[PDB]
Amino acid sequence: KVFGRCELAAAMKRHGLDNYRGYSLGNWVCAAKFESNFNTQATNRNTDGSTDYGILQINSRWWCNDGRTPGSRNLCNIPCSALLSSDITASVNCAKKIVSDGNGMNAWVAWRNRCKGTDVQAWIRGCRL
């Protein structure tokens, strides 16, 4: 599913992501924009053989099982395919664990490089929230 910007903001809010670990909703929408372009089916293979999945590009090295990342963990206790669903629940629940792991949203490289320190409220501006 390719979400619209305000559509994703609303889904993230409903699932409790807004202000989670102190990160306002625009931070989450901006991260999704640059990780996945709002496409739940996004995937990206990394040089190490791990893969990033879904709207927040969550990595199989640590967070989900894909059966093809040796020595990896599955700390969200989910198949990585669950992160590709039209329903963002699994992605949101796993993102809450990631952002709680000590480095905040710096876990998402596109957030650090493209959202951190910017006017992230622009991503939710205009939305009926």
UniProtKB/Swiss-Prot annotation:
Organism: Gallus gallus
C-type lysozyme domain mapped to chain residues: 1-129
Active site as annotated: 35, 52
One GO cellular component, as annotated: endoplasmic reticulum
EC number: 3.2.1.17
Protein name in UniProt: Lysozyme C
Binding site for substrate: 101
Role played: Lysozymes have primarily a bacteriolytic function; those in tissues and body fluids are associated with the monocyte-macrophage system and enhance the activity of immunoagents. Has bacteriolytic activity against M.luteus.
